[PDB]
């Protein structure tokens, strides 16, 4: 296209032959707008405002100053394919992503821009509808190509389709609702150029779902995972466990990460297929980011984060852009547990000892692949990749089970909500997950099994876990739950949890807690 230059690196996009934009911006959002209603209409973000905002939307440069002092020889860098998959993404957000990539990516290093319709049902996206998308693409460069999935396959199914169509040596995956900062692709290509085993991910920034403001700081560089099988950014007490030379790293140095946030990463195409690509039995939205990350490290790969590659992302708030089956997320977590070896016992209990159809036949074929590849163990992963975790070995979970007081013959009970912010009760013991708690010794945390983010407090309530003395309990040899700071013990006198002076002679402050002596091998549940 014509009109290229700074800020419009592929030329002026989306312009009819008459010099007029092919897209009419909506009027300003109505003054009387109930944000909860609008967040639930646009699928987790204010669509009224998005439809009013320009597609060539200027974004603040979120990169640190030292990142802008770096130079790249675009002739020596390999070209890449950008892959944006989407299911029923609105026109404004999807095309703003396209314009942002085209305007912000030098053409010398962008082989193509693949758009994958994961079986969308919206009229503007359908080939039996109003044909808005196809028509507007004619006003974009030919690098942009639209491929379509006959039926909604899911994230893994759509990404694999785009990767298998990409023709560049390197590919980069991006969500359909993003805005890039300057020189976002160049630092990633340089990393993969020097080692095809490196999978490099940008640092994710924020676009407020309600106001669409750009927020510096989304998902940092170093992130681990929760035993609910979920990516989780390093916390303070965890970054403190890092080697002293890695706690305040340089703004430009690349940092390894045990896990990725998902769907914003770049990789060498050939290595991606040799290291397992994706497990295509994953369904819809899910935890493919953790299955990839574990397998990546264990099978001879390196996951790192490029602090100088920043991309803005709309984190959905108060709504969801699509509806996925309820059993899909459970299945993806079961398949992910193949790579966790004995540690899968803890994850299985945290997600509720589920018993679904995790496609056992397919997973066996990947256990073989894992063996023929020589992949390393999850113990190795924890002791070498994520050694800063609160549970490096299952011996860090000494107790898992009911917390019973034999004097009153009752067990602690999360009362129907392992979520933080509610009081814990005392109820007759019944042997359900609502009355099973776990202990993490590295941090002194007493949590319900179904949420490792919920920590018991001397207030008798659960609150968000923090690696501080505000949540450090000691389980004495006498059976007392002692709070370290206050040096008081937890009592069940009067069927009301209270803190009292420690006294092993007081039966109301003596608790029993089942020891967690897991097996050495996790046997998957029968289907």
């Amino acid at each position: 296209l014509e009109g290229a230059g700074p800020g419009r690196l592929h030329g002026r996009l989306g312009i009819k032959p008459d010099g007029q934009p092919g897209y009419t911006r909506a009027p300003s959002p109505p003054t009387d707008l109930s944000m909860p209603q609008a967040l639930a209409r646009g699928g987790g973000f204010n669509l009224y405002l998005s439809d009013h905002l320009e597609l060539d939307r200027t974004a603040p440069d979120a990169r640190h100053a030292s990142c802008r002092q770096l130079h790249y020889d675009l002739s020596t860098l390999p070209k890449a394919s950008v892959i944006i998959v989407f299911y029923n993404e609105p026109f404004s957000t999807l095309m703003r992503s396209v314009h942002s990539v085209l305007n912000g990516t030098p053409p010398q290093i962008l082989e193509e821009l693949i758009l994958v319709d994961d079986g969308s049902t919206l009229p503007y996206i359908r080939e039996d509808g109003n044909q808005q998308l196809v028509e507007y693409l004619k006003l974009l460069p030919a690098k942009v190509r639209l491929i379509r999935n006959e039926v909604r396959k899911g994230i893994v199914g759509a990404r694999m389709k785009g990767i298998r169509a990409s023709r560049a040596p390197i590919f980069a995956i991006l969500d359909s609702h993003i805005e890039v900062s300057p020189q976002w692709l160049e630092p990633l290509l340089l990393r993969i150029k020097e080692d095809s085993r490196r999978v490099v991910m940008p640092q994710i920034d924020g676009i407020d779902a309600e106001t669409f403001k750009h927020i510096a700081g989304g998902i940092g560089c170093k992130l681990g995972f929760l035993w609910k099988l979920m990516e989780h950014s390093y916390e303070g007490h965890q970054t403190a466990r890092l080697p002293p030379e890695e706690r305040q790293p340089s703004p430009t140095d690349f940092q390894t990460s045990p896990a990725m946030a998902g769907g914003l990463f770049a990789a060498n195409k050939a290595f991606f297929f040799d290291v397992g690509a994706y497990d295509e039995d994953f369904q819809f939205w899910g935890t493919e980011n953790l299955e990839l990350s574990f397998r990546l490290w264990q099978c001879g790969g390196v996951l790192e984060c490029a602090p100088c590659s920043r991309v803005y992302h709309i984190f959905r708030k108060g709504g969801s852009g699509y509806s996925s089956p309820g059993d899909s997320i459970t299945i993806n977590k079961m398949r992910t547990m193949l790579w966790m070896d004995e540690y899968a016992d803890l994850a299985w209990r945290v997600i509720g000892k589920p018993r679904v159809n995790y496609r056992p036949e397919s997973l066996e074929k990947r256990r073989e692949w894992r063996k023929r590849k020589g992949c390393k163990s999850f113990r190795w992963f924890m002791e070498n990749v994520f050694p800063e975790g609160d549970v490096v070995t299952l011996d860090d979970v000494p107790y898992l089970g009911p917390l019973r007081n034999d004097k009153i013959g009752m067990c602690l009970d999360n009362m129907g909500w392992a979520s933080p912010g509610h009081a814990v009760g005392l109820e007759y013991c019944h042997g359900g997950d609502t009355q099973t708690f776990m202990f993490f010794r590295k941090v002194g945390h007493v949590m319900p099994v179904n949420d490792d983010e919920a920590c018991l407090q001397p207030s008798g309530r659960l609150d968000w876990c923090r690696g501080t003395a505000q949540f450090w309990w000691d389980f004495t040899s006498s059976g007392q739950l002692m709070f370290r700071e206050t040096k008081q013990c937890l009592s069940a006198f009067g069927r009301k949890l209270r803190m009292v002076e420690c006294d092993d002679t007081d039966p109301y402050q003596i608790w029993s807690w089942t020891a967690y002596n897991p097996p050495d091998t996790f046997t998957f549940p029968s289907v």
Partner: peptide, 6 residues
Amino acid sequence: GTTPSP
């Protein structure tokens, strides 16, 4: 869905 860091 994915959530930002605190």
